[PDB]
Design a protein around this ligand. Structure first.
Ligand SMILES: Cc1cc2nc3c(=O)[nH]c(=O)nc-3n(C[C@H](O)[C@H](O)[C@H](O)COP(=O)(O)OP(=O)(O)OC[C@H]3O[C@@H](n4cnc5c(N)ncnc54)[C@H](O)[C@@H]3O)c2cc1C
Ligand SMILES: Cc1cc2nc3c(=O)[nH]c(=O)nc-3n(C[C@H](O)[C@H](O)[C@H](O)COP(=O)(O)OP(=O)(O)OC[C@H]3O[C@@H](n4cnc5c(N)ncnc54)[C@H](O)[C@@H]3O)c2cc1C
Ligand SMILES: CCOC(=O)c1ccccc1S(=O)(=O)NC(=O)Nc1nc(Cl)cc(OC)n1
Ligand SMILES: CCOC(=O)c1ccccc1S(=O)(=O)NC(=O)Nc1nc(Cl)cc(OC)n1
Ligand SMILES: Cc1ncc(C[n+]2csc(CCOP(=O)(O)OP(=O)(O)O)c2C)c(N)n1
Ligand SMILES: C/C(=C\CCOP(=O)(O)OP(=O)(O)O)NCc1cnc(C)nc1N
Ligand SMILES: [K+]
Ligand SMILES: [K+]
Ligand SMILES: [Mg+2]
Ligand SMILES: [Mg+2]
Lengths: 599, 598
């Protein structure tokens, strides 16, 4: 084994510093602690990268995710042992669900104290086993470079995800006394395989060229390659195929394009859902058929399954991970690998399509029939959440700046998804798989660090905001001019919505006492704005976006407004609840009675 | 009968409600979520117990711990799946380290969706395996009563600890269609009893033979209502000096002349010396962790010789056999509940007249190595230690029951050192895991447990930031907690270590703080601040007197080291002491190395 002596003499901590440089890391989010001190002393005043300090490790994790989402690079986290480590479990679980590249370094007690119920000791490798693509505890400093390189490679390959490297204090404080393999200190296809993939591509092209009512079901995977959107559009334009995206796919397709069906799924656009239930061929690109998208699985894509049975269609799946191939529904053709790459190889085999009048006409009728309708403002009423999104979307867009939107979890999140006009990739950063409330703020901060020149807006919910509102000061300390928008309905919207629907309006502990958000913002060091009256919304939104420096804008919005359309329970994607002003008014009455006038 | 049907017809959620009643649960801390909704609908407006809502599940967990610590009852947590569950990992790990009784119920996706990478699904049982005494996923509603009972029993027996019960939505929503064994619904040795007796005997002999005996007491003594009482008895009967661990504070009255105070890396010098010179160490409810033993090979040197010459050594009253002879080899091991065995051993103890020789040496140390520090000079900043002493008196002079919670760091050590501990179950601090942010949420839980008590949270600025959002929860729950922030605008304990071991190189140990007073006001509490020495007394009195929750920020002197200190490979007797000169020279050294920034 060829040896390297360049790290000989350095401490684990110093080697760590050098590896961050070699891994092209320009930002690290962390919080110091005793066990990890050897590494902190090493990166003290280091100019190899910028360090962002949160008030809580969970903040660090979510900042790393936001950063990764906006930059495309893996988010690096550096925390101490014990509580410092357990505090980043949620962010890891979150990054694991949404496939976000993240390398988490957790300090650990000295190897000689491990297993002795030592001070601030935790079985981090054990705890994080199920919420990381891979993890490891570095046994010796000689092993450090290697592990760091494996971590970054695993985190950024296949389906991106989080990895954890446990760093024992004695290992990071130790000095390298031995030369180590040159390989282990440097970063980073079968002919029959590529032969097999080309075969898959040909079969997929054959099916596409045969389809009469095709639909592109696009997900996050298309955004893991710079040319993803470009090729997706080319395919769409070439074969005249309408496109629908998941929550994590928004931004990949231009919603201004006539062929846009918008988001599909539980709270998706009726047109998109209808298109999916009636299509003879579903081309899934970088999407995992999760349960918030498929509706009742036995009712999913009936027309596509029928087409399959008749051998004239079905489902094509461009998936990068074998774990998600044929996991939820049986597919006819599975094109393994990087979606974008395979779309590029397949293009030339796709026959150019002149038009699909029938199909598009049907889709257009649904578009006229099922828009994202809702109860708009009326004289004297409170501001409507949906209206805020629509307006902010325009104001933000009219600035001509690059816009990135992050959100919390709940109704506001769904309305942001539905009513915002998505056009640019890597501009919507939201927690979908795990759905972590409190993701909004810290994610926005990370995103702003990744894209300093972008207008980063966090469309949050009051309950979600409370979870991590302490990072508000971090935004100030980090110099991230994030714009925090709070759609305040003084309730846990998404939950109350379910309680309204399935629990006869019995709201069990789903209404919390909020602090004065404006005074809070002021106390934290930001500008604070509030809006109650419809008349002032436009002015405030403009001041909000225009303000230089971090700013928080609270918008008092109407309460108990349900998010629609809605497919839940055993309903098929085409069996959605539609908005009805008459029914809303009826439900309202029924609510006041059932809650004894409480809500 | 053998079979019980008092549940047939009920939903898992309703059964859960009934079980909380049967388990004598009067408080539940939680946060709703989709997966756990069936249980929330069931406990809706339930009058079987009070529900406390935090802003974050971590808050719920720490509130449960504080509640458990102050009440003696297990803390019950109810959260949803996915993020709701992962958010209580830290509190569980914490409760696991300090042996706190806690039953955590986490909602889970329907059994039919488990393993499909379902919405808000997490392998909770897997994640929490290493930080819970036991955990389980309820497979069916028939199994619900059983699991709930096993959980509470395991959480409250042996060495208390946290347990987690995973509740699948389809299980809690399901209706019980089958009658279940009456036994399973009701809230639930050997001949080793001779070995214990033999031990209790040999220990009593060894104690009656000791010349320089020391009582090294821990949290274990507080796990029994008669612990403190029986501890004093033994101490008085055999005239033995008593030193307690951080988690032991409050089990022994520090007013008694036989009190050595706290031992350990930041413990009283006298306490450490006594331990190092003792021929016999009686360990009661303590696990010899590294923050106490110092350099293990240099620990209890005289106790060793006494052990080698068969005239003493180490006696250990431990409930968990796993912790016996885990750190240091003991001579006698009395298994079981410390309090119980102390009662059984009492009579076999010869009533000592006096130990004037031992006490002479001990009182010699007390006069020489007290908790000294650089006191306030004119115009200088308020000293953290002073605030603690002053508050200790003010709080005490109110005649109310006082409970103190803290964050993690220097302020925590100063609270331990300079407060005069006398009542059991009055100091609630995170020691094993040492979780910053524990202070506030713990105080809230403690206040819920003891409504009439004056609950004070002695926090640090950095620690406070971690969970400062629960400030509004305090208001919503109606818990008039008193939040004290010793603001040194730094991560004190870490800067102290950076000053000591890393040549005054403060790497990311200075966070930007918000306006604590405006923060408090925004959260709905009264906010007070103190900068001048002259106003400290007035503010402390107003602080304690204020009705309702209140926060007081006291600007204190920065870069103040917690002493004495036993770090690295130092034995408990090789501690660093306070020196006025040494400190002035250290300040100048810090100024030179930092250009003048610190
Ligand atoms: C309250 C709430 C409501 C929600 N409502 C909806 C809704 O109505 N509709 C909806 O769609 N979502 C909704 N979501 C989000 C949902 O839970 C899922 O997180 C999301 O739909 C998953 O989208 P995705 O499959 O595109 O992305 P991912 O879950 O990230 O999956 C991407 C898939 O693409 C693969 N992949 C990754 N990279 C590549 C590559 N380079 N080449 C090829 N394949 C690749 C991955 O292996 C994976 O299988 C909601 C979330 C919450 C919290
Ligand atoms: C910054 C910081 C500084 C610290 N500094 C110090 C210091 O200077 N000195 C110090 O002492 N601590 C210090 N600590 C706390 C320390 O880390 C340990 O948490 C603490 O000393 C453990 O005390 P304990 O053994 O009494 O309690 P535990 O750790 O709770 O252990 C109790 C033991 O008693 C047993 N037990 C429980 N119930 C019973 C029963 N009913 N009958 C019999 N046995 C029972 C248990 O099995 C266990 O072995 C510090 C913590 C932090 C965060
Ligand atoms: C929290 C760090 O814990 C260590 O990793 C650790 C654990 C068990 C035994 C010895 C050490 S050690 O003696 O290698 N290191 C420390 O004890 N460090 C340490 N750092 C800080 Cl900032 C505070 C502290 O103690 C109160 N202790
Ligand atoms: C978050 C709870 O998730 C469920 O446990 C879950 C998981 C996978 C598949 C079906 C369900 S389900 O159809 O039994 N329940 C729900 O889907 N519930 C649910 N509750 C809320 Cl408050 C919001 C929500 O969706 C946006 N969904
Ligand atoms: C959640 C968490 N993150 C990091 C640590 C590491 N840590 C232990 S003590 C300490 C010092 C800072 O506290 P502070 O509240 O400012 O009080 P001080 O020590 O200054 O009195 C730190 C950062 C921890 N214990 N818990
Ligand atoms: C409560 C909940 C979603 C949304 C609620 O409220 P919010 O005010 O933030 O937004 P709206 O829905 O009211 O807009 N689900 C459980 C949950 C608990 N805890 C965490 C960290 N994440 C979660 N998803
Ligand atoms: K849209
Ligand atoms: K004391
Ligand atoms: Mg809300
Ligand atoms: Mg501090």
């Amino acid at each position: 084994p060829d040896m390297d002596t360049s790290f000989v003499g350095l401490t684990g901590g110093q080697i760590f510093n050098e590896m961050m440089s070699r891994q092209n890391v320009d930002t690290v989010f962390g919080y110091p602690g005793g066990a990890i001190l050897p590494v902190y002393d090493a990166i003290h005043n280091s100019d190899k990268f910028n360090f962002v300090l949160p008030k809580h490790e969970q903040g660090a994790g979510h900042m790393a995710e936001g950063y990764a989402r906006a930059s495309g690079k893996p988010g690096v986290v550096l925390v101490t042992s014990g509580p410092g480590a357990t505090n980043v479990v949620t962010p890891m679980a979150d990054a694991f669900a949404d496939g976000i590249p993240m390398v988490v370094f957790t300090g650990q007690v000295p190897t000689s104290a491990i297993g002795t119920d030592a001070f601030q000791e935790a079985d981090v490798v054990g705890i994080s086993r199920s919420c990381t693509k891979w993890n490891v505890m570095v046994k010796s400093v000689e092993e450090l470079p290697l592990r760091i390189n494996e971590a970054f490679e695993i985190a950024t390959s296949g389906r991106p995800g989080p990895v954890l490297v446990d760093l024992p204090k004695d290992v990071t404080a130790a000095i390298l006394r031995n030369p180590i393999p040159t390989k282990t200190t440097l970063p980073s296809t079968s002919r029959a395989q590529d032969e097999f993939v080309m075969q898959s591509i040909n079969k997929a092209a054959d099916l596409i060229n045969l389809a009469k009512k095709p639909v592109l079901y696009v997900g996050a995977g298309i955004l893991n390659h710079a040319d993803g959107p470009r090729l997706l559009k080319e395919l769409s334009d070439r074969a005249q195929i309408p496109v629908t995206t998941t929550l994590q796919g928004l931004g990949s397709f231009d919603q201004e394009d006539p062929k846009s069906l918008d988001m599909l799924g539980m709270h998706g656009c009726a047109t998109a859902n209808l298109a999916v239930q009636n299509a003879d061929l579903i081309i899934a690109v970088g999407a995992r058929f999760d349960d918030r998208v498929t509706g009742n699985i036995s009712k999913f894509a009936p027309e596509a399954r029928r087409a399959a049975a008749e051998g004239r269609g079905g489902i094509i799946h461009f998936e990068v991970s074998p774990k998600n191939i044929n996991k939820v529904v049986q597919t006819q053709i599975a094109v393994e690998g990087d979606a974008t790459t395979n779309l590029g190889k397949m293009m030339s085999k796709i026959f150019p399509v002149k038009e699909r009048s029938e199909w598009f006409a049907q889709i257009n009728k649904w578009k006229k029939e099922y828009p994202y309708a809702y109860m708009e403002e009326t004289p004297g009423s409170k501001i409507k959440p949906q209206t805020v999104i629509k307006k902010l979307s325009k104001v933000a867009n009219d600035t001509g700046r690059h816009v990135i939107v992050t959100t919390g979890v709940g109704q506001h999140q769904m309305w942001a998804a539905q009513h915002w006009t998505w056009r640019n990739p890597h501009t919507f950063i939201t927690s979908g798989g795990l759905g972590t409330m409190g993701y909004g703020l810290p994610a926005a901060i990370g995103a702003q660090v990744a894209k300093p020149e972008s207008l980063v807006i966090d469309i949050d919910g009051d309950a979600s905001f409370n979870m991590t509102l302490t990072e508000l000061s971090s935004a100030v300390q980090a110099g991230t001019p994030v714009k925090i928008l709070i759609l305040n309905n003084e309730e846990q919207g998404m939950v109350t919505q379910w309680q309204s629907l399935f629990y006869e309006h019995r709201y069990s502990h789903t209404h919390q006492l909020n602090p004065d958000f404006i005074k809070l913002a002021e106390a934290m060091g930001l500008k604070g704005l509030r809006v109650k009256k419809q008349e002032e919304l436009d002015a405030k939104l403009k001041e909000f976006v225009s303000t230089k420096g971090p700013v928080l804008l609270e918008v008092e919005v109407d309460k108990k407004v349900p998010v629609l359309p809605m497919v839940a329970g055993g309903s098929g994607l085409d069996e959605f609840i539609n908005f009805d002003p008459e029914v809303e008014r009826q439900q309202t009455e029924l609510r006041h009675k059932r809650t004894g006038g409480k809500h």
